[PDB]
């Protein structure tokens, strides 16, 4: 111990200091390199405060006695299939109008009076309470004369600024996360009435939206109905034209995404009617891939995840068809509910139309790109429509849509995408409309050749 003491002295102590001097230089070097790597590393953008309806699809439910079953229709029964609705990974239920509406009369139609035929507020409170735990927020339609020739009253329902206003306060007290009105062409100068109600709803809380609707396909009418307010998710007949032409389904989408550019929109074929009222059968798979990938929020009626066809199954009312839950869910003249059509006859098939909807909704409601990734669409073959959904550092995407009759090649002449999102030569396939292509095999975009009426969906995370 003492021999060590004498040995810590001139000549070999000079070494001792230098050792921890080099050690401290090395440690400060490690720390400085760390902070430089912190500085050099790209700082990502901020998440733009997504609401609940910004995350997943909505789900309109028009006729309860047709969504539930003849005679069995009531508000309580919605608890039975609320797990089915949460299986689709939806985030809303446009449910209604379930208020008291005798007929065609303004003084005999109250919004604040729940319709007894669906069940009173005893079932409604339970509806909300059991909807909250599955994160399936409820939205109620207030179209007052929803049982007459015209959706809005005839002479003048001026009391909408009174009655609907009291509704937008009372029911927001109850806990309904948004509302909706339909055929806002009849609502005389709706742009100010919608202004009042949107002011009420957003000012009440920003986690409370307001959807509208109209039967117009002219963008000028839609823009003039989006006159001042731009947080209103107007669902219109803009796409109601069957279209599918190489430019209509291209030009309409671009031009509407060119009016406000990025402002959040709502994507739906119609305000109330099903997909199949307009779409031929072979495009039912096709459009569901488009609507889930376009920027905005998709809106689906009941049975648009399985394609309720009024042509295959007769007897169905044209406005409100009957949902098929099982092998006897049709109570009228039976014999046409063969397992192909039903829900359970499609929950098992991996290639079923319901399964496609489930995969698409899972991807849409989960991965950060589809929620809020920017949108760029580039030129391609005459019957195509390709685009990309890219965010800051999250996964990319790519979708190809053949709207023609003859199998075409991709013809990807992109040549203008930002260098942050420029296409690679092989992209990881994820799914397809018409199955058969191996889902997971990176496909080549120079030899990318389509089949008629086929979609695609690919992935490429190059520091994306």
């Amino acid at each position: 111990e003492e021999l060590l003491k004498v040995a810590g002295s001139p000549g070999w102590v000079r070494t001792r200091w230098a050792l921890l001097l080099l050690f401290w230089l090395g440690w400060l070097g490690m720390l400085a390199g760390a902070v430089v790597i912190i500085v050099r590393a790209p700082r990502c953008r901020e998440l733009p405060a997504q609401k609940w309806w910004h995350t997943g699809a909505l789900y309109r439910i028009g006729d309860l006695q047709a969504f539930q079953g003849h005679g069995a229709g009531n508000l309580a029964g919605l608890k039975g299939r609320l797990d089915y609705l949460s299986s689709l990974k939806v985030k809303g239920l446009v449910l209604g109008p379930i208020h008291k509406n005798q007929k065609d009369d303004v003084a005999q139609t109250d919004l604040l009076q729940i319709d007894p035929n669906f069940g009173s507020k005893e079932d409604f409170d339970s509806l909300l309470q059991s909807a909250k735990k599955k994160s399936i927020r409820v939205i109620l339609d207030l179209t007052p004369n929803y049982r007459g020739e015209n959706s809005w009253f005839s002479t003048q329902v001026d009391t909408v600024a009174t009655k609907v206003k009291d509704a937008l306060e009372f029911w927001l007290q109850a806990g309904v996360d948004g509302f909706q009105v339909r055929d806002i062409e009849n609502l005389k100068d709706a742009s100010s009435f919608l202004a009042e109600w949107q002011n009420i709803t957003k000012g009440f809380s920003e986690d409370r939206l307001l959807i509208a609707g109209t039967n117009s396909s002219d963008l000028q009418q839609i823009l003039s109905l989006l006159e001042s307010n731009k947080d209103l998710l107007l669902t219109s007949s803009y796409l109601s034209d069957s279209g599918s032409t190489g430019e209509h389904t291209k030009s309409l989408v671009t031009q509407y995404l060119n009016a406000t550019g990025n402002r959040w929109c709502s994507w739906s074929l119609s305000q109330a009617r099903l997909l199949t009222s307009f779409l031929p059968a072979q495009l039912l798979r096709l459009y569901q891939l488009m609507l889930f990938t376009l920027p905005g929020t998709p809106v689906f009626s009941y049975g648009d995840e399985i394609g309720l066809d009024a042509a295959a199954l007769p007897g169905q009312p044209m406005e409100a068809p009957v949902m098929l839950w099982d092998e006897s869910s049709f109570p009228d003249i039976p014999g046409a509910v063969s397992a192909n059509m039903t829900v359970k006859g499609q929950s098992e098939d991996p290639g079923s139309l319901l399964s496609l909807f489930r995969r698409l909704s899972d991807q849409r409601s989960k991965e950060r790109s589809l929620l809020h990734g920017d949108f760029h669409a580039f030129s391609a073959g005459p019957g195509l429509f390709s685009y990309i959904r890219h965010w800051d550092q999250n996964e990319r995407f790519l979708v190809v849509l053949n709207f023609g009759d003859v199998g075409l090649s991709a013809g990807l002449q992109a040549s203008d995408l930002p260098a942050s999102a420029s296409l690679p030569a092989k992209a990881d396939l994820l799914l397809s409309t018409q199955p058969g292509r191996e889902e997971g095999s990176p496909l080549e975009l120079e030899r990318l050749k389509l089949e008629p009426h086929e979609g695609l969906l690919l992935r490429f995370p190059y520091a994306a």
Binding site: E1, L4, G8, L19, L31, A34, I37, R43, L47, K133
Partner: protein, 455 residues
């Protein structure tokens, strides 16, 4: 009484393992209900292992911990290999695994939702290791007061997850548990590796020396303080994983990088302010658990001639294990710079669990041949022949699985068998190894200014 002993031990088992392992377990389990039973099984197996070690230490009474528990039950030959394997595999990898998570959770506040570059994490990890070792080497008192404060911050690091994880159970947020025992395939080929994560969380009872001279009323409060304090820890970890599972679904738990940060940002509003600072303070307390824990092993081993005489000396003043850290430091750098946490943990747990299942298997030998020698505590012969035959079956099966990170561990352990030529050899070639041994001894104890303990 046993009250303080329960606190003493429970301050060791709890740690960063509850933040590092969950995703690892779920990875190679494929389910949620099948993952929450792995945690329970590893909890009961840790109970069995600690309860066996308590008997090993109570029937030998040669103080020194794990090393002495193998020195004479088998012979010096496995004992030297135990020290070799620990100081070449276990302690470096364990430190680098705790600190690879500390470095992540200390950079999480700055990279709020970004992809932290893999090298920044390693650089911050190495800086943290260097800070911890300078703290342990410059002074001791401030390495114990800080350890107490960090134990408190370690308890808080899990009470800050359990409480928000049960406040939503009382609400009724049970949705991820519906198909509990169902998920991916995850065959038996990936069950041992999940076992490794499961038993890594319940770490600390290894280096937990027990004394019959000080502990009040022995044969009473040594097992009655491990039975009723590993059950508490098992319950705590089960509830913590349940809290993780109620919020985070299995899939986004799998794709995540740190679990506590996701749980915080999905529950709390002040998430970055508290959670990836208390988890970091708990990981810092865990890596601070290298405080003399390894140096006592040097002191015990070097006495009967296994480690060099250098490695068991203390500073002239500022008395610290200075030579015991400049040997654990470069190895830790090599591990954390040339390895991955999913591949360092296999490397760690193969060599740990092999030489623990070969240790507790000694009990089944000491009870049969040479029996009835000062046996105050007496476990029934159901726990050793259920812990030995589980370590030596989740390890022997961990070579059919992942042989490129456990195969190297097995090679290094086997290298200990030749490495017994350092201990015994016909001649050390005075000029060619003895001269360098003496010169390095001189230089190493003259540079560090360290002296023998009291010899």
């Amino acid at each position: 009484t046993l009250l303080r002993g329960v606190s003493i031990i429970i301050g060791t088992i709890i740690g960063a393992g509850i933040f590092i392992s969950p995703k690892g377990v779920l990875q190679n389990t494929g389910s949620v209900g099948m993952s929450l039973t792995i945690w329970t099984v590893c909890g009961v197996l840790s109970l069995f292992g600690a309860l066996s070690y308590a008997e090993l230490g109570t029937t030998i009474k040669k103080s020194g911990g794990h090393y002495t528990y193998i020195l004479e039950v088998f012979g010096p030959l496995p004992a030297f290999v135990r020290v070799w394997v620990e100081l070449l595999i276990i302690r470096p990898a364990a430190t680098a695994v705790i600190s690879l998570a500390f470095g992540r959770y200390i950079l999480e506040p700055f990279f709020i939702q970004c992809e932290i570059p893999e090298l920044a994490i390693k650089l911050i990890t190495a800086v943290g290791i260097t800070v911890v070792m300078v703290l342990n080497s410059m002074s001791v008192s401030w390495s114990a007061r800080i350890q107490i404060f960090l134990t408190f911050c370690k308890l808080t690091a899990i009470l800050i997850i359990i409480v928000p994880g049960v406040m939503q159970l009382i609400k009724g947020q049970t949705q991820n548990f519906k198909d509990a025992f169902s998920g991916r395939d995850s065959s038996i080929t990936r069950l041992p590796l999940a076992f490794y994560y499961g038993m890594y969380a319940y770490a600390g009872w290894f280096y937990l020396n027990f004394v019959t001279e000080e502990v009040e009323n022995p044969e009473k409060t040594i097992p009655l303080a491990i039975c009723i304090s590993m059950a508490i820890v098992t319950i705590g970890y089960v509830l913590t994983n349940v809290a993780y599972f109620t919020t985070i679904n299995a899939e986004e738990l799998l794709l995540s990088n740190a679990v506590a940060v996701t749980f915080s940002e999905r529950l709390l509003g002040n998430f970055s302010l508290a959670v990836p600072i208390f988890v970091a303070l708990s990981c810092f307390g865990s890596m601070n658990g290298g405080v003399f824990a390894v140096s006592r092993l040097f002191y015990v081993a070097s006495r009967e001639g296994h480690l060099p005489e250098i490695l068991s000396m203390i500073h002239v003043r500022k008395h610290t294990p200075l030579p015991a850290v400049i040997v654990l430091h470069p190895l830790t750098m090599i591990m954390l710079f040339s390895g991955d946490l999913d591949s360092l943990l296999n490397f760690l747990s193969f060599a740990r669990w092999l030489f623990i299942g070969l240790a507790v298997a000694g009990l089944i030998y000491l009870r049969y041949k040479c029996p009835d020698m000062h046996r105050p505590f007496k476990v029934p012969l159901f726990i050793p022949a259920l812990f030995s035959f589980t370590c030596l079956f989740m390890v022997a099966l961990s070579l059919y699985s992942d042989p490129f990170s456990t195969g190297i561990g097995f090679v290094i352990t086997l290298t200990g068998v030749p490495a017994y030529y350092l201990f015994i050899i016909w001649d050390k070639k005075p000029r060619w190894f003895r001269i360098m041994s003496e010169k390095i001894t001189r230089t190493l104890q003259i540079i560090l200014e360290v002296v023998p303990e009291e010899d």
